[PDB]
Swiss-Prot record, chains C, D:
Name of the protein this chain belongs to: Single-stranded DNA-binding protein
Record domain SSB: where: 1-99
Keywords of the record: DNA-binding
Residues in coiled coil: none
Source species, domain of life: Bacteria
GO cellular component, one term: nucleoid
Subunit annotation: Homotetramer.
Keyword ATP-binding carried by entry: no
One of the GO BP terms on file: DNA replication
Full-protein residues shown: 3 to 120 of 164
Protein source organism: Mycobacterium tuberculosis (strain CDC 1551 / Oshkosh)
An example molecular function term from Gene Ontology annotations: single-stranded DNA binding
Amino acid sequence: AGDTTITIVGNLTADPELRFTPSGAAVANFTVASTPRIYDEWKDGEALFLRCNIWREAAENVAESLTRGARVIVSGRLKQRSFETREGEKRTVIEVEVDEIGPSLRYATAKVNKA
Amino acid sequence: AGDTTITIVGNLTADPELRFTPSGAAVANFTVASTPRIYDEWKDGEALFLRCNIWREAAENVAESLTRGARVIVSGRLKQRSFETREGEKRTVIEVEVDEIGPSLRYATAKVNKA
Amino acid sequence: GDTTITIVGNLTADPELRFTPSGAAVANFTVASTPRIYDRQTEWKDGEALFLRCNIWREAAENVAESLTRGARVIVSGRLKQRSRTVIEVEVDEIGPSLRYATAKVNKA
Amino acid sequence: GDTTITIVGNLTADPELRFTPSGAAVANFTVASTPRIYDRQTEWKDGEALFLRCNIWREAAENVAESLTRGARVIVSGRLKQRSRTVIEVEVDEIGPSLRYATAKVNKA
């Protein structure tokens, strides 16, 4: 189905965690901190931390290509979930299923190596 | 600062709530339910409910132009917040500060009236 | 895999409605998006102005034809496509009148 | 107020680096985005292929020049702008190599 996609630019809060599923598929998890502009001065504002995940090869590349602090351009779709019941109440979580990710060449360089 | 914007299409979970601030400014709140495609059949999947808010005039127009069920195209920026402390723990909320919103002409018509 | 974009702007003129030889409806129109420029506390101004032509099909274009006219403010979500010289247009997925400076009485099908 | 878009694709060829008469660096390149087509359980295929030319300035274009070459897969975030006949290009805000089929050793400034 897909729908509702977003593009976010920010830095990894920590190194990408690459763990393997029993089926052989790799999963790369990382949260992206997107910290805004400035003015007059210059003031960092708001900030948005989004939990991301990517699989297969893309996941492995990511794991051995990015580290904590890396500024990246992320594209993917937004996924939400909700909780409940009469003894406590309503909780909401959200994540991004990354379609593509790359380190930003805004404040850095990098020598790419296709396979 | 801005940054991280999104565009979502969906239906209002309920009529837009228009309340007035003591300062005279109007606030329009509404949550958008974005329910996905299908196939083979046809299966509604995932679903994403996003709390939106718009002010000033745009807010008032919205309030007297849209109702529960209305299919709309929303554009704006994503805003997140986080909670905490040693007796309970971590909670996260998110909202969209609408820049522009309009009813969709995908499954309907509407006669617009500029002011 | 398509490249999607969202654009806000006004209709260069009344939407053009036609019918392919098969019967399918087709509406062509162009949106003029005018930018932001500032100085903040020293007067803002509008930008270069971007003109993107849009196409919409089936029962949706029939809705555009019926609701939108010249100079209407609209928000468009679609996919960039380039023709065959060779221009870049937008195949509309969703479109509706912006409620920024206007109200509207919607009517479901 | 600008119209922003995100595009994935490969570099039509090595990036073109030049310097305005003032000294500012400028990199021009074009991204070829190739779509998705399917049948699901009956073989998928790629689409029409969109070609958008991109420009990037200052110390960022100097980074593009140094990291990207012909055929590299990249993800671009920018703003649509139309020139003066009259074409539509993308003024890049951020760009980096897609890690879909490749790794990379980044190096902060």
